[PDB]
Write a structure and sequence with these properties.
This is part of a larger assembly, with five copies of chain A. Chain A is mostly beta strands. Chain A is built from three helices and 22 strands. In chain A, strands 1, 3, 8, 9 and 13 form a five-stranded antiparallel β-sheet that branches. In chain A, strands 2-10-5-6 form a four-stranded antiparallel β-sheet. Chain A is globular, with a radius of gyration of 22 Å. The two termini of chain A are 20 Å apart. Chains B and C meet through helix 4 of B and strand 1 of C. Chain E: Pfam families: Phage_Capsid_P3. Chain E: Homotrimer. Chain E: Keywords: Capsid protein, Virion. Chain E: It is found in: Virion.
Chain lengths: 372, 370, 372, 372, 369
Amino acid sequence: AALRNQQAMAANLQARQIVLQQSYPVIQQVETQTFDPANRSVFDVTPANVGIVKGFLVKVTAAITNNHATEAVALTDFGPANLVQRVIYYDPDNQRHTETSGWHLHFVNTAKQGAPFLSSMVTDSPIKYGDVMNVIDAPATIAAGATGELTMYYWVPLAYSETDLTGAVLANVPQSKQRLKLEFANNNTAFAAVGANPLEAIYQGAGAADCEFEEISYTVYQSYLDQLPVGQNGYILPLIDLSTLYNLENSAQAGLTPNVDFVVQYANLYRYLSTIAVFDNGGSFNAGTDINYLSQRTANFSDTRKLDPKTWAAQTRRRIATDFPKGVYYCDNRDKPIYTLQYGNVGFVVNPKTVNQNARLLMGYEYFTSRT
Amino acid sequence: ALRNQAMAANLQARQIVLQQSYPVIQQVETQTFDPANRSVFDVTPANVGIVKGFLVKVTAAITNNHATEAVALTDFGPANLVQRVIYYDPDNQRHTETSGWHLHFVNTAKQGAPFLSSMVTDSPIKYGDVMNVIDAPATIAAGATGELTMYYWVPLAYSETDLTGAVLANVPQSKQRLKLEFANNNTAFAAVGANPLEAIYQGAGAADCEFEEISYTVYQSYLDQLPVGQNGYILPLIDLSTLYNLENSAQAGLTPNVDFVVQYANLYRYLSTIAVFDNGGSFNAGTDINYLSQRTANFSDTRKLDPKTWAAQTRRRIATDFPKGVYYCDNRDKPIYTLQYGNVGFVVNPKTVNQNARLLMGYEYFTSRT
Amino acid sequence: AALRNQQAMAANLQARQIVLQQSYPVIQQVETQTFDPANRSVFDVTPANVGIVKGFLVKVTAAITNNHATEAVALTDFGPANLVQRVIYYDPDNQRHTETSGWHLHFVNTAKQGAPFLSSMVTDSPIKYGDVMNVIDAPATIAAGATGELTMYYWVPLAYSETDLTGAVLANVPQSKQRLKLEFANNNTAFAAVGANPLEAIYQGAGAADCEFEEISYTVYQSYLDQLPVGQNGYILPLIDLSTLYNLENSAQAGLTPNVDFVVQYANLYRYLSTIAVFDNGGSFNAGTDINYLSQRTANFSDTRKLDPKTWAAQTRRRIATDFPKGVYYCDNRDKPIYTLQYGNVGFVVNPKTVNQNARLLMGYEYFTSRT
Amino acid sequence: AALRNQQAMAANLQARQIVLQQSYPVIQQVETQTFDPANRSVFDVTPANVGIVKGFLVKVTAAITNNHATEAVALTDFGPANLVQRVIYYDPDNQRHTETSGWHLHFVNTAKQGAPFLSSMVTDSPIKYGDVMNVIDAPATIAAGATGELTMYYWVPLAYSETDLTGAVLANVPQSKQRLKLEFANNNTAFAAVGANPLEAIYQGAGAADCEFEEISYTVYQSYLDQLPVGQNGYILPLIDLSTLYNLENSAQAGLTPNVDFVVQYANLYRYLSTIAVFDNGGSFNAGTDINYLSQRTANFSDTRKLDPKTWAAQTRRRIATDFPKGVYYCDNRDKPIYTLQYGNVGFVVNPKTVNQNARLLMGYEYFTSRT
Amino acid sequence: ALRNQAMAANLQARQIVLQQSYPVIQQVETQTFDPANRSVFDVTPANVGIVKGFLVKVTAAITNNHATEAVALTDFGPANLVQRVIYYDPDNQRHTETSGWHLHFVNTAKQGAPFLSSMVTDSPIKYGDVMNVIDAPATIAAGATGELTMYYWVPLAYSETDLTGAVLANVPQSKQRLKLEFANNNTAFAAVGANPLEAIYQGAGAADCEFEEISYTVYQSYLDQLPVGQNGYILPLIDLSTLYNLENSAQAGLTPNVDFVVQYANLYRYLSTIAVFDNGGSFNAGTDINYLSQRTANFSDTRKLDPKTWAAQTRRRIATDFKGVYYCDNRDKPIYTLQYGNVGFVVNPKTVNQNARLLMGYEYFTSRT
């Protein structure tokens, strides 16, 4: 009783280690396409069915021309992170894993790297290191009549990390394809007029109505483990890792009122590793000034980290070495995931100071859950 | 496992009862009233033989006293003439406790077509909607009075041939209780922009609509002349010690693109599930949903489907679609039965979630009186 | 002698019942794709190899634009049922089961449901039931310059029904894939000009030459039984059910002449459950007026149901509660399948009243046959 | 000792024969697509998992328009053979087999046929045989403003031949898909300007910059053996044949200097059946005039066929009844494959007479090697 | 299964016969005639040794007597100099019964290139069409006379090394019958717009074309000096009791986009199939066909292919194409149903003209039973 799982854990970990030691990691291009967003913006990519799939690195480039006669546009807070609006992955058994927004996926990529994802840090080095290759790049502004070039990368995870295969997918089933759906930005989502909500946009400004994509291009690279190890009983595989879902999902909630606790409940069964809360205060994104405090509480009137916005931000600076954009708040629960079974119902709390019309909290979650 | 013997006996006894007794449908009560004065009634069934169910006939006259604005039927319309029903047997045990609209949708699921409806055909012979069995004006114009008729079947027995859930009432004098809560001037009419879920009519003239009166007649269906044997009454003991109930519940906490899971309880054998996506007062034809499913912990989904494909399965069951935002799931041949609370859940992954969104659940299940 | 089969029958039925009682039914998505028919229209789907496969529910959607400057097009009699031109299934042993046209598969789906497949019946109910979800839908006409949206569903059967597993497929063989081939409509088959044969088309009219698909999308859902029951001798399985083929096939025959019996022979060995005969009278499809009578006869000059077209149609109204489209005739032989061994050669007969140029009978059959 | 292999050989050959005698050969379409190279040119085809796979016949058609106002373009030496730039195949175990250029695959198809692949020979026959069906076809020139239509076929081999199953693939593993990757020509590879290197191009000429594909279409047909024979121990299969890789691969080497032996070493372990050497003399392809001689030598200063270009070409005329295009040299070692273990290191030699800037030798190899 | 023994013996006997006997090709008959008077001839072969086949040489002079219009060769051209052939062995059993054009196409399929053709090469040495073995003027102008030469090989034995189908004729005096029906003034010339299937020339001057004369010479190929053993003549009994025949048939009832299936009979082991799509007198290069295939009931198609891909397989067999003529090689694994129609040849037409039909041609083995 319960000892069977203690054994299962060791067997799973043992097999994971053997797989990591014996297999060979491969990153391979699976598809590349250049398109005009005016014609199409939704794509369904069919990755290869080889060994254990760890994730996908998605490269996105775009050329945007601001055709306005006189006015410019400037990057929104999320900018190129909004080149992909939504990403959804389905495994060979047609089970959904990650299903979230490009901006949420990007903030998690940053959280897991411990710094702005794939960024180039600035130093005093006289040797010419720096932003040489423009891996993630977008012009701060695009003047009237100008064309800007952007590059963005997203890592869509299946496995939790390079050493923790929890969430990985065994794609060996012939005739049963995986599916990576990408819903890209287009001329209706990428450009926000002055005064409009910039949340999902790339550029905002007085020239927005005349901005257009010349083209968008994407290349999907699939990362997997080949040459899987075989034993007496055949393929040595961590069964728990491969039967666990590691997913990112987002949601939206409204109903905030000044000085009243707004509580977003965590669902049961899911083990929440991180939580992101974006306070879209009716299109306004503020640097903590519209919030009294944020917290996580296990009901029973018990906060584990009720903090003023600046102190909450301080905890985040310890995790990613900088602040997330205005109105974006992060919470790390990786070592002790929020799990309602072992702590009772828990909720994420925001007590707003100021609430504009159409205010809402956009939540992003990272979690583990059993397939069955 | 002396169960085989128990079940074998139960089934034999059921057949003898069906073969030997005689079916009776009898009026037990009629009443006319004004919702302004009262809307909750406790009907006392007759204690005779084996009770199978109650057919409740409801008629109403609604007057739109507005000066110039009309109102139109909501999606549920006359199905909201009864807001709730509750049945207590002679032993003080509750069976069904649910909403009028859920009861109606189950009546439809069990019939295999919109309950007591008249199907349209090319027949030149004048069959058709001759008797207006379930009927309500599509609109009631300013100053007009509309006449409505609605029927509900409150089941105790599962069907005419399966007496599981039936109630033996020749037994003690202890009374049965059939509680009915009717629509009133506060629930029947929804203003433009208001949630129409529980209403009968919605529109610009709603504030000035009112019931002229409501009338109901309850007919009790039972088996009389029960067969007697050596030890006495030949009765299906399993059938009569099992409860067949309909129940509803409400759940909230939906978030775009995240699986919203409503856990099934253990002990109950769930025959069907209905989930209504009240998206903050808006009812959409699947466009606000990514997919629906039924899932077992650590064994994934047994039917994760897009909304149209989910609707396709329902079309095979009732020959049409349920109203907008209403989703049905048939598990009659293999009832959801966890044994462990929440081993199985009903899933809805929403595409868009408005303010005050929630899922209104409706269940049909069997469970032992224990 | 012959008693071994009487036992085999009981053993087969007993095992079928155990399988149905013990296994758990599952319907799961296996593949979804959106494509432009101008680029490709033939797909080979590789389903999953899990337990006993009962069939596939195929969802097909499409957007069609009529680019003609002035003329409209209208649905043909078959309409969206022609979104799939042909379907062919191969089991793990590479044996072919169903191999037929989308229209034939659809008429059989209707015959087995007892009403137009997945249709919404019209009633006097004031409660808002009806065509709410547009499960099978297509606009009656597409005007010049307009775009119409269509949805179609086909059930590709392996097992005869949900309770009769005859024809089902055991897909447990690792490395031996099943194959579901779908040949979709395209810009050359979907649109018929005025006067052209509408048989295989979706729309016909004066604007046909300028009609085009914007896109077609399909999703294949696989229905199967999981958690198969095990006994003393291992897996309990109905061996006769799993070694019998339940197939739909179609063919074409020509050579009709006014007032002369046109006879299409049934082959031996096959047990024919139903027969569909479409009188493509040179592109004209008539409501029985071009036929004297139809029949089934066991040679030896012996008709079992020689009937005038209206009386033949009456028998069909008893089966599907309405008539099949113009020129489509149905015959139910489910309780007593046509089997030449037990009745001698048998043929399906049509004695035409009028025969246009290029007249032919398109036959559709539903049958059971032994793998070996 | 070593006698076990002598037995294994006989068992393998015996089983191969049984398989060939008992199975039934099938060639079946698996996928067809029409696309615009401007949008995409790389495709990953998932073939069916049925029985023993022998190879794939790939049909490619294209429409090319020369939009130049005044100048024409003419076929390069390789022409339509460059419609496919690269082909790569992976078996169910994710092991790579052929990985080469379309031109190399085509020259090997020719070598194995004993004449230009799928060509129509010219004869004096008065009966109208000839190029009736244009199986492999391309207009010699495409004038300014004209559109040309091309058809090309490639056979991608797994099995060595129809009677020698060495290299064939057992594709029965459910959930483990094979993969046939095709990288097609596009508007950047198909058209060479005057003076540019024509190696990978289809057309070259003064109108090249304005040439474009209207479309490219491909259809993949899979050839396999069905109804595999079963014995006492189950499936009768040639284990050596099925565990041996028959692959084509190509490479590039530079560093040539006039009158000096340029040697390309053969790797160990591989059994080389044929060698192709293309002398890309800085974009110039000459009919032997830039070469002193070619040879194969087993190191130890020992040539087995050191020949002047015309005599080398004479040996090739005995194999394919004509010459390969300018600068393309072929060497048949089928009966006695080059194997470094049994002959020591061996190399292919070219001693150039003239060497232009950017000269290089493009090598194409056909070989057998053990999976393990 | 004493078959292994029978086959083992048969094969050994065949090899002894091939090793010990001596091949002979001998003229048995020559004749010149005017098609206006007669066009059907019954040639009597010599009854000697084991007969392998007959080489039939046909020459003809055609005069275009039209005042001003010419005619041009049809697609089959001189292959239509013989309309039909029928062979009866000494036991009154028929072997081949087919058309001259089908016989010619099989001659080509068996050679692996256009029968008795001269391949063109870059050789400076003057090899080439020196002897005009099979030859016919592309056109015959008004007032001109053209000279034609055609050869046909009527096989009994399957090949020079496989005596299956050969005939033992040293046997009874009972005569063999090689029946030949030649083209005549009514079949050789097609008017513009008329079906050219069976014609040699077609064109505006056709009505006034005529044969000046036709001549034929039949050469018989056989094995003499048969080996004798203990019991007597050492003979491959299976080879000599098996018939190797070519036969043709016609089928109609084609409809656009519908599978047209021609069933194969049982008992016969079909080595090859030829299907000619006579689309109402029009012969197209695959453009009127969606696909062709060979299919087994309840096991789908073994080779459903588009017309060009079907043609590609044929190019591997005869080094050229294959208009409207389609070939299928099943030599290594002959179509053999056991049940009539278990297998069929399929053609799904794209366009069907009036009077469309498929003209089938078969090569098969079957026991004398």
